[PDB]
Amino acid sequence: GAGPEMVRGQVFDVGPRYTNLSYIGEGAYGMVCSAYDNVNKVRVAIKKISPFEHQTYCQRTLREIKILLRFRHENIIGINDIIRAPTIEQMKDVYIVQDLMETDLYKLLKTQHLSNDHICYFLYQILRGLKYIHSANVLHRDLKPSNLLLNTTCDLKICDFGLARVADATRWYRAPEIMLNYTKSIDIWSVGCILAEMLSNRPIFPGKHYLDQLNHILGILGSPSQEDLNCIINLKARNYLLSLPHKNKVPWNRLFPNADSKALDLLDKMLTFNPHKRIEVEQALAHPYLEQYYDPSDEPIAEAPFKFDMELDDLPKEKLKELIFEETARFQPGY
Numbered sequence: 001g002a003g004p005e006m007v008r009g010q011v012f013d014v015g016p017r018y019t020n021l022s023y024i025g026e027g028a029y030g031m032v033c034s035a036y037d038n039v040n041k042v043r044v045a046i047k048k049i050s051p052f053e054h055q056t057y058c059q060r061t062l063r064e065i066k067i068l069l070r071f072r073h074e075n076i077i078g079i080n081d082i083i084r085a086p087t088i089e090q091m092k093d094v095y096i097v098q099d100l101m102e103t104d105l106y107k108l109l110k111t112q113h114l115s116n117d118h119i120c121y122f123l124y125q126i127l128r129g130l131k132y133i134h135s136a137n138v139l140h141r142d143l144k145p146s147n148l149l150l151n152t153t154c155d156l157k158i159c160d161f162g163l164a165r166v167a168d169a170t171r172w173y174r175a176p177e178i179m180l181n182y183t184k185s186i187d188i189w190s191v192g193c194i195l196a197e198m199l200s201n202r203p204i205f206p207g208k209h210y211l212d213q214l215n216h217i218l219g220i221l222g223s224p225s226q227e228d229l230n231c232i233i234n235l236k237a238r239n240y241l242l243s244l245p246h247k248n249k250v251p252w253n254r255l256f257p258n259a260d261s262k263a264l265d266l267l268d269k270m271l272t273f274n275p276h277k278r279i280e281v282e283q284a285l286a287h288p289y290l291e292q293y294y295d296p297s298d299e300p301i302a303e304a305p306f307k308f309d310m311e312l313d314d315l316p317k318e319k320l321k322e323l324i325f326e327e328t329a330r331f332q333p334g335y
């Protein structure tokens with residue numbers, strides 16, 4: 001017998017079906033590896049999570065599992081298999097088996113210059129997947145380059161649905177609403193930040209802290225209008241913003257001198273301060289910049305909207321642990 005697998009001192013008890021592990025990434029309460037599947041004869045991605053000590057991690061874990069099990073779309077990552085201990089007393093870790101992708105957008109932007117057509121094509125696939133997510137009445141809430149996975153043929157899939165929620169983060173990609181004390185339009189903002197980063201290979205709003213984040217935003221958009229501020233904003237944020245000196249709006253064509261003016265027009269409509277005036281996903285797909293890829297015939301939507309039977313916030317982590325145990329039962333031999 002081989003014994004339990006191990007990656008960087010950390011156990012990976014992924015049975016005899018999954019072997020040849022390599023580190024490919026990490027998260028807050030887990031680690032991602034690639035592995036050889038001896039059944040399907042492919043290498044896969046295994047996501048190990050260890051959520052049980054924290055009630056929030058348990059919540060995210062259950063939420064990600066229920067959603068990815070339900071969603072079925074080519075621009076969304078799925079779950080092919082889930083491994084965990086045969087008993088609830090023994091369950092300290094959950095392993096989620098997923099299609100292996102070549103890399104993420106974070107890394108690609110780190111060493112590659114994108115042509116306009118590739119920007120255009122990546123943008124299309126993000127929005128297409130976001131169409132499905134939003135049709136399901138779900139917010140991803142953490143769109144960013146490292147959560148966008150790419151394969152050898154530039155196919156794109158959204159990953160990490162841990163922060164995903166039923167319709168009502170990373171600082172650089174979070175909408176001004178979020179920080180001003182939300183709806184589907186927070187994802188559009190993130191997609192905007194991502195477009196801007198594909199254009200110049202650098203984040204458009206790299207705030208060191210939440211305050212510095214709001215500065216960077218206003219550093220391009222200009223001082224907020226009266227109506228822009230009026231949104232049940234917290235006293236702190238509003239007073240500070242009102243105390244700042246005037247900031248002039250920087251034109252997109254000056255910040256991205258060589259960018260397709262169509263790309264910039266859409267970029268403008270996504271990075272709109274006021275979320276009510278921000279472009280929605282379908283209107284985005286239909287934008288002239290994407291005409292070459294827009295195909296309403298081939299852009300599927302969720303059969304029905306998503307809903308949670310129980311209110312997960314209210315549940316103690318021991319109740320949540322039980323639910324993760326049950327949700328993952330169907331992947332258990334016998335069953």
Ligand SMILES: Cc1cnc(Nc2ccccc2Cl)nc1-c1c[nH]c(C(=O)N[C@H](CO)c2ccccc2)c1
Pocket residue numbers: 024025026027028029030031032034045047048049077098099100101102103104107146147149159160162
């Ligand atoms: C699911 C998946 C499939 N393939 C790859 N490939 C890949 C991506 C980037 C660099 C190199 C490679 Cl080979 N990656 C993934 C993947 C990437 N991130 C995650 C993921 O879900 N991460 C979250 C945090 O973002 C996480 C991970 C562990 C524990 C909690 C949360 C899966």
